[PDB]
Structure 1
Amino acid sequence: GLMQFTLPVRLCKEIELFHFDIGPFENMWPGIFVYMVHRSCGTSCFELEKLCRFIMSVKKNYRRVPYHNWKHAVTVAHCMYAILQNNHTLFTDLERKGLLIACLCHDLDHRGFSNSYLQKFDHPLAALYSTSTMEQHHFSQTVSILQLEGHNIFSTLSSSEYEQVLEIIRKAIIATDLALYFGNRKQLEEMYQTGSLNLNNQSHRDRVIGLMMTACDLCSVTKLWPVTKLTANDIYAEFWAEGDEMKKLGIQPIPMMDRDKKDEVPQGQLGFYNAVAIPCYTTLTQILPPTEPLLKACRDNLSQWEKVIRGEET
């Protein structure tokens, strides 16, 4: 009850910044997450014994793939934590509680393959969930873990608060399907510019939380250049394994997934920073001004990729 989680001084200070890296020591990731729920939500948000058991069941249900792993989960929750702490008063007690859990859970039981590969392989999950295949699976895994005995961290919510938090988490996890991002951001763009955007409109909050989710999910483009560059190696290690598997099914993969196109990674990052990342953090900064450092960091990492193409490297 009187039990504060603390971190060493360099972490205590640097965790409050958008560009924090959670480091290579796996056994500290859970302490980092609990520290962020305590500071973001309060020490009374969750019963500690249930939270610890939930965290550890969540961890056990991430797989040892190069990118979509436990490290990605805690990285995406840390970005959400930075967004919530820099916009403290825009969000409900239920949103603060639900969104950090959403981020920890958002890639539960990922196998290192896109929705596309599931559909072309004809994986059972693709018959059960025709669109946002892995994302419906991720939410479904969250609900399973919440139903294990001693794991309902939401046990002290009312019946209707419980349904509202599970609904925030479901929409939050669905929005990490980058196929849904383009339309969501277009609509947020136009609503902000015509002045229609209204944070009391529940379906407007929905779109805004959806964009925050895309921002946190892509936050590897907002880190120090060495973290950005080394994560990109993990990201392509999955995409090229998928490409390999596509060729095994008799199908030319898209260039993004073809390891024969290593040479063009720099230009593919440019495309990605211009088509996805910059627009994402641009719209998020307009809507929530205190998230600007994500935009500025993204812009800095785009310059680093231009530098790689030009022969300077950094």
Structure 2
Amino acid sequence: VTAITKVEREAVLVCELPSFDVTDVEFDLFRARESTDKPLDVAAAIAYRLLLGSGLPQKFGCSDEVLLNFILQCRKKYRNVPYHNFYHVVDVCQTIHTFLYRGNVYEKLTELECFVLLITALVHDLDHMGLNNSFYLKTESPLGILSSASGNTSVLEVHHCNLAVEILSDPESDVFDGLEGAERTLAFRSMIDCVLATDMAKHGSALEAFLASAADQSSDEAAFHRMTMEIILKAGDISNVTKPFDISRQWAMAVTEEFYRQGDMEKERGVEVLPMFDRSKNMELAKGQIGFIDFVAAPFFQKIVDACLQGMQWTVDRIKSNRAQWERVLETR
């Protein structure tokens, strides 16, 4: 890995981000991206501002320079795909910030764990190529073969953890360098756990485990803290439908184009192409989003809020209003 230059940091530090409140739940990363000639710099500056404002890097001996090196080292490893690019992970970081601080989830965690969540958001999709786990397995890809051979089917999640560990192995980009002993161990293990938990094939079991812990006043503390962390990263990962409508719709366009490119590649290779990934179905954006709301996101946010995370009620409220808005698109078509 090649060291971040000073000129690279200066480009990020130059961004003043006037008019944006990065801590707000109605913050608009799309508008932030439009605001400038250099969206990648603005994106990094948002991540930088969020991390510094939390008070957290300073507390764990992570300097301003090392924090920004880390951010830029993550940015180098994201690709130019429609959805799983650096804007997605900056969005997950910003959203998790809002769940911790606007939603009061910080109350259930330590500050180390809060620090870890904010950083894990930035590593959690490192080097995503716009193709899901199933594509690698269906096509018998080298990457997919290695996963089957070694017994872990979370193809990309394990990949992301491996690049995260690389960035953190140089002191100049290790935001956990100020830690040692059991704490540094916890930072790496909880980071890795969280990323492994974002495999959507494990979505149901992760939810059931969190919910079961949350209902049990004699749950192991460490286990509950860990499951909370995993759940908050998962929440950020599927939080598109909890933003105001046009923000939420822009994410949906981005993921739709990304899925389509996968399906075009699957067609070429002669493997199974699902409906959601097929250009020829031209499936309505409103039906896709409502199906995702009804089958994935509304039950998830509702269950985790009722169980435990009451301050996150606004996410349930907004899913409801976005669902009603998509129903209006149908009604008037």
Matched, 1:54 2:65: no
Q: Which runs of 5+ in 2 are unaligned?
A: 1-12, 34-38
Return the offset for 1:302. Answer: 1.3
- Say whether the 8 Å CA contact 1:65–1:112 is kept in structure 2: yes
- Say whether the 8 Å CA contact 1:61–1:109 is kept in structure 2: yes
Q: For residues 48 and 229 of structure 1, do their structure 2 counterparts lie closer, same or farther at Cα, with a shift above 3 Å needed?
A: same
Q: Deviations over 1:9-58 (max 9, x none)?
A: 6323xx23223222213322222212211222435142111111111111
TM-score, L = length of structure 2 = 0.85
Matched, 1:20 2:27: yes
Distance 2:241 2:16 in 1: 25
Name 1:133's counterpart in structure 2: 155
Name 1:203's counterpart in structure 2: 223
Amino acid at match of 1:122: E
- Pick the aligned partner of 2:115 from 97, 108, 122: 97
Distance 2:302 2:227 in 1: 15
- Pick the aligned partner of 1:223 from 210, 231, 243: 243
Q: Which runs of 5+ in 1 are unaligned?
A: none
- State how many pairs are aligned: 304
Q: Deviations over 1:90-143 (max 9, x none)?
A: 211220121111101100000000100011122222233331110110111100
SS at match of 1:19: coil
Distance 1:291 1:148 in 2: 36
SS at match of 1:10: coil
- Pick the aligned partner of 1:10 from 19, 26, 32: 19
Matched, 1:302 2:312: no
5 Å matches for 1:1-314?
Answer: 10-12=19-21, 15-22=22-29, 23-24=32-33, 25-42=39-56, 44=58, 45=60, 46-86=62-102, 87=104, 88-130=106-148, 131-148=153-170, 150-192=172-214, 195-196=215-216, 200-286=220-306, 287-311=308-332
Distance 1:190 1:144 in 2: 35
SS at match of 1:150: helix
* Percent of matched pairs sharing the same residue: 29
TM-score, L = length of structure 1 = 0.90
Amino acid at match of 2:235: A
Q: Deviations over 1:159-208 (max 9, x none)?
A: 3211110001001111111111112213334554xx31557532222222
Distance 1:251 1:124 in 2: 16
Q: For residues 124 and 189 of structure 1, do their structure 2 counterparts lie closer, same or farther at Cα, with a shift above 3 Å needed?
A: same
Distance 1:216 1:37 in 2: 16
- Say whether the 8 Å CA contact 2:109–2:225 is kept in structure 1: no
Q: For residues 90 and 39 of structure 1, do their structure 2 counterparts lie closer, same or farther at Cα, with a shift above 3 Å needed?
A: farther
Distance 2:216 2:251 in 1: 38
SS at match of 2:79: coil
- Say whether the 8 Å CA contact 1:18–1:293 is kept in structure 2: no
Amino acid at match of 2:19: R
Distance 1:187 1:213 in 2: 15
Distance 1:94 1:118 in 2: 35
